[PDB]
Design a protein around this ligand. Structure first.
Ligand SMILES: O=P(O)(O)O[C@H]1[C@H](OP(=O)(O)O)[C@@H](OP(=O)(O)O)[C@H](OP(=O)(O)O)[C@@H](OP(=O)(O)O)[C@H]1OP(=O)(O)O
Ligand SMILES: Nc1ncnc2c1ncn2[C@@H]1O[C@H](COP(=O)(O)OP(=O)(O)OP(=O)(O)O)[C@@H](O)[C@H]1O
Length: 1011
């Protein structure tokens, strides 16, 4: 049913149940403006079963600046907008069935037909009809989920209503957590101690279940409500009547579906529940709602939007707002600034804000149709007032329409900023879904369309994949395996033929820094990143800091996302921020003492790596190095020691010669992994073995394993052996057919297979946590002689040909299901889980964890893209510091967090002289200029005498070190030995602290010029 090859990322987000719920459901969408178009695109990407778009308007030239499917031909033909776009929308997802309608909505229009839709979304509608439709929807049985959203210039309104009661199945959709129990007290209420340095991160009132408790078997399977006492403690209710705590136990999070209560739209006017996006001005959203209501009343009164530059319109609107505020529950003070700006820009349309609101509202429709997350209750008022705020007091000439496609945007931000936008030269790194949305935004904004200066540069090396069609909407299935940037630029050309773009198929890295040299950065104005990993982000941040250019970064996963802004001399840089690295699983944990399913899947993954990539490559490279097995035999006979040769030889002795031999090898490997390991470990540690403190060695987090009895009939075992045999045949270049995987043939083979008996040994076990993988074990001469015997055996059997010395080397593909990599990893991890009494995991979760595939969804991408576009608008405007806003959000709650960005910090070194990360010093001079002259020039220009000198690793001068103090006589070029290609050289200096003996305070990097 569910096309994982298409849906896998969002499948990791919402869950297969959600997909089977967007299936069988039907949604009605009306308005088909820019906002409605965004909704429709987001939903069809998401894969809702069927969508009915509605629009009665005719095509206009004004619609072209906000619609990326309309063309001038459609306006010429005066077609219906929905009719024109219907063909293009269906291209995004053929699985969805899409219909169009144009029945005008009015007072006499009957709404009974709407019952076929479980959710209704309205855009570009007059308010009383919205009231009527909301009433009809919420009066239905079941009530139709109602969503309204509007955009007016820089202002936007979003509203939601799912009826008076709505059941949210999953509140926020995270993985439930598990915490090992350190101790439980017998008290009323009993208090449970978590494992030390493992905080539970829970909430008072949350519900937990328990299992494996030694002592309290009764609460194993019980559910209690907690009351957080400490990060490692909380009360769980009375335990006095119970047994003493012995040991063990694990508490597990319990999810409970909840009920959320909405209100009718008309009633919500007086008492609007408003989500907060900036806690510094919590009352502002109420002001925004008041202003929008005043605009609605204005449109009711005059059948038109207020006109820019009309002082009478602004006065009337302010009067209306003041009258309306008196009718409000709280009666907030009317903000004249908001009213003035709305009157100035009511008729405009700002595309990025519309895109962001569209993404958010679409995610709300997903919430409505699935119950997967807590919905909005009930209002949202996003805005970009800061953009026009920096404009001071402009006039209408900037915003007067000029007959072009950009008239809506011009009415928003004025023509001069449009000119600047068309003249921008933008470098975009990475062209993922975020990149595609940025391209769409630029095309809508006309960025770079100016032939004078405009140029959009983008680069990305990866090819298009079917799995990327879900989010990277610019592409089509016939674009698979083609360069991403090329197809993206081609598609963007369709959106805006005036645009100018240059695509590259290159990864951004220090190796490619030659092409992306500092001059190339100098030509650019802005840098936008749609990267996936952090290291590339830090490298790009270093390049941006070197070239002193603004940089915008964003990252998304699941419903969570964030946007961050860097401005020279204004903000801190990404590398300034630092975090602890990702947690490395302990070597003893992953090798011998797993405790979580993640440990087992990790073990499966690296065992797969060793068995199919690493070891075969070692074998092949070894035989590339050494010509013949007889040569190796001669060398070993003459006492030669070749690193890892012994493993190569043992590999040779293990080479199967037919499919049945591969099957036998797989069976033996199964035995070794899941039977012999447990037996060996238990021989080393019986369940009754105890520590010196008298406690049992086997306790949490350690888990005593058990050998697994082989079973041909087990489907898990069948899949495991099948994938193993397939992989081994692939590596050893042994052909086969699918009938070889039949249980009949496998049973036939295994009837002859004899299993060698287990033999316990006494290998040293790195049971300690701190232990890590050591060096190679010194192979005894007995093992060497055994290998020699096997070697001459192979030589006599003539098994020394080039084919014997060559084998296939694989790579971990995850998207192709037929290679069986995912199947093998799943089988191995599940089997290892049963060894340690751990519940198995499904295939999709296994693929997610092993491949480290980040869950993603189109709505979050669109929203973060809109935010990034707004911030790029601000930085291109050269706005003051306060305008720029870092933002973090989580659609699950949902929650939006705006904040002022991190201000750059200034560090004083001496005499009040302070500098920043942005600052770099420069000097000029001559060849015969000396180091002492350099010190003097520094003390002159910057009022401070250098105390130590280093150029990279060339540790140049310190007064205290004897042999280098005399270098002050030497000139620069003979001393540092620079590369003459440059006219200069860069250097790092620090200054002795005001209190001597402390560390020298480092200054900014300084570049000295030879001339
Ligand atoms: O070399 P690795 O892939 O890291 O794994 C090795 C390997 O097992 P595989 O053969 O299945 O890869 C060893 O066997 P050889 O390659 O040397 O034949 C085996 O040693 P034994 O054959 O003596 O069991 C050893 O087990 P250990 O490290 O416990 O001695 C095991 O390590 P892991 O299974 O933990 O990776
Ligand atoms: N150093 C780099 N230079 C150029 N492009 C890069 C670099 N690092 C990452 N990218 C690009 O960043 C993009 C990130 O977008 P996205 O998450 O859609 O990637 P993906 O590989 O298609 O997806 P997935 O991570 O789900 O496999 C990738 O398409 C990748 O090509």
């Amino acid at each position: 049913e569910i096309d994982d090859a298409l849906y896998s990322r969002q499948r990791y987000v919402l869950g297969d149940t959600a997909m089977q719920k967007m299936a069988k459901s039907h949604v009605f969408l009306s308005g088909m403006g820019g906002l409605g178009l965004e909704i429709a695109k987001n939903l069809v990407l998401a894969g809702i079963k069927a969508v009915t778009i509605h629009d009665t308007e005719k095509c206009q030239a004004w619609d072209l600046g906000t619609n990326f499917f309309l063309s001038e031909d459609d306006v010429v033909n005066k077609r219906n907008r929905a009719e024109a776009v219907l063909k293009h929308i269906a291209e995004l997802n053929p699985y969805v069935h899409v219909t169009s309608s144009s029945v005008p909505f009015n007072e006499t229009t009957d709404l009974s037909f709407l019952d076929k839709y479980q959710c209704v979304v309205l855009t570009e509608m007059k308010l009383p009809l919205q009231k009527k439709i909301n009433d009809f929807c919420r009066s239905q049985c079941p009530p139709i989920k109602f969503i309204s959203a509007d955009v007016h210039g820089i202002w936007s309104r979003l509203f939601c209503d799912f009826g008076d009661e709505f059941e949210v199945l999953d509140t926020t959709g995270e993985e439930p957590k598990e915490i090992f129990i350190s101790n439980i007290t017998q008290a009323n209420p009993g208090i449970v101690t978590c494992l030390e340095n493992h905080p539970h991160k829970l909430e008072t009132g949350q519900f937990l279940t328990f299992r494996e408790i030694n002592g309290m078997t009764g609460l194993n399977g019980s559910i209690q409500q907690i009351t957080v006492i400490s990060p490692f403690s909380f009360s769980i209710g009375d335990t006095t009547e119970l047994e003493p705590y012995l040991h063990g136990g694990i508490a597990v999070q319990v999810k409970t579906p909840k009920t959320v209560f909405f209100e009718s739209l008309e009633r919500q006017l007086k008492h609007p529940k408003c989500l907060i996006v900036d806690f510094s001005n919590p009352e502002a959203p109420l002001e925004i709602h008041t202003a929008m209501l005043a605009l609605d009343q204005f449109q009711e009164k005059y059948s038109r939007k207020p006109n820019v530059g009309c002082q009478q319109d602004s006065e009337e609107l302010l009067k209306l707002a003041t009258s309306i505020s008196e009718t409000l529950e709280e009666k907030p003070d009317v903000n004249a600034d908001i009213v003035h700006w709305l009157s100035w820009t009511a008729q405009g349309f700002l595309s990025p804000l519309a895109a962001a609101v569209g993404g958010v509202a679409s995610q709300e429709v997903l919430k409505a149709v699935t119950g997967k997350f807590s919905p909005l209750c009930q209002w949202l008022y996003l805005e970009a007032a800061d953009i026009v705020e920096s404009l001071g007091k402009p006039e209408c000439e900037e915003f007067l329409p000029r007959g072009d496609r950009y008239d809506a945007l011009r009415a928003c931000i004025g023509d001069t900023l449009c000119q600047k936008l068309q003249n921008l030269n933008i470098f975009l790194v990475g062209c993922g879904a975020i990149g595609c949305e940025m391209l769409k935004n630029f095309a809508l904004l006309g960025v770079g369309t100016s032939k004078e200066k405009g140029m959009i540069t983008v680069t990305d090396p990866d090819l298009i994949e079917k799995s990327n069609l879900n989010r990277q909407f610019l592409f089509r299935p016939h674009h698979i395996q083609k360069p991403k940037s090329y197809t993206a630029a081609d598609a963007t050309l369709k959106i805006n033929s005036q645009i100018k773009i240059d695509a590259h198929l290159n990864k951004v890295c220090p190796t490619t820094e030659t092409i992306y040299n500092d001059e190339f950065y100098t030509k650019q104005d802005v840098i936008i990143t749609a990267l996936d990993n952090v290291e590339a982000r830090r490298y790009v941040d270093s390049r941006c800091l070197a070239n002193l250019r603004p940089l915008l970064d964003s990252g998304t996963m699941g419903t969570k996302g964030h946007t961050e802004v860097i401005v020279p001399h204004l903000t801190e840089s990404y590398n300034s921020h630092r975090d602890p690295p990702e947690e490395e699983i302990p070597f003893s944990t992953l090798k011998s003492f797993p405790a979580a399913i993640e440990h087992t899947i990790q073990w499966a993954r690296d065992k797969f790596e060793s068995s199919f990539s690493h070891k075969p490559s070692l074998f092949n490279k070894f035989w590339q190095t050494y010509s013949s097995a007889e040569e190796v035999l001669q060398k070993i006979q003459s006492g030669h020691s070749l690193e890892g040769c012994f493993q190569v030889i043992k590999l040779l002795s293990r080479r199967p010669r037919n499919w049945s031999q591969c099957v036998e090898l797989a069976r033996l490997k199964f035995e070794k992994y899941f039977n012999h390991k447990a037996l060996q470990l238990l021989h080393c540690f019986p369940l009754d073995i105890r520590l010196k403190d008298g406690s049992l060695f086997w306790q949490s987090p350690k888990r005593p394993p058990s050998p697994i009895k082989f079973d041909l009939n087990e489907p898990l075992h069948l899949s495991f052996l099948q994938n193993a045999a397939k992989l081994y045949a692939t590596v050893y270049c042994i052909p086969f057919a699918e009938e070889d995987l039949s249980a009949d043939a496998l049973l036939n083979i295994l009837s002859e297979v004899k299993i060698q008996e287990f033999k316990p040994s006494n290998k040293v076990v790195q049971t300690d946590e701190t232990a890590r993988k050591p060096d190679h074990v010194p192979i005894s001469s007995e093992d060497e002689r055994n290998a020699i015997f096997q070697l001459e055996k192979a030589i006599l059997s003539n098994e020394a040909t080039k084919s014997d010395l060559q084998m296939a080397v694989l790579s971990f593909e995850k998207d192709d299901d037929h290679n069986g990599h995912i199947d093998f990893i799943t089988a191995a991890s599940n089997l290892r889980a049963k060894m340690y009494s751990i519940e198995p995991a499904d295939r999709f979760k296994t693929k997610r964890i092993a491949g480290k595939i980040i869950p993603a969804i189109a709505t979050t991408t669109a929203t973060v893209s809109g935010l990034v576009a707004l911030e790029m608008i601000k930085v291109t405007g050269g706005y003051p510091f306060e305008a720029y806003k870092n933002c973090f959000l989580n659609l699950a709650i949902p929650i939006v967090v705006f904040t002022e960005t991190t201000e750059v910090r200034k560090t004083k070194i001496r005499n009040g002289i302070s500098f920043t990360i942005w600052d770099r010093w420069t000097v000029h001079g001559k060849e015969d200029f000396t180091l002492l002259d350099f010190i003097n020039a520094v003390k002159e220009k910057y009022g401070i005498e250098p105390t130590m000198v280093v150029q990279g690793v060339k540790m140049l001068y310190v007064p205290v070190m004897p042999g280098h103090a005399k270098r002050l006589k030497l000139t620069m070029h003979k001393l540092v030995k620079p590369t003459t290609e440059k006219k200069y050289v860069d250097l790092t200096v620090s200054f002795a602290p005001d209190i001597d003996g402390d560390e020298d305070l480092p200054g900014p990097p300084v570049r000295y010029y030879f001339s």
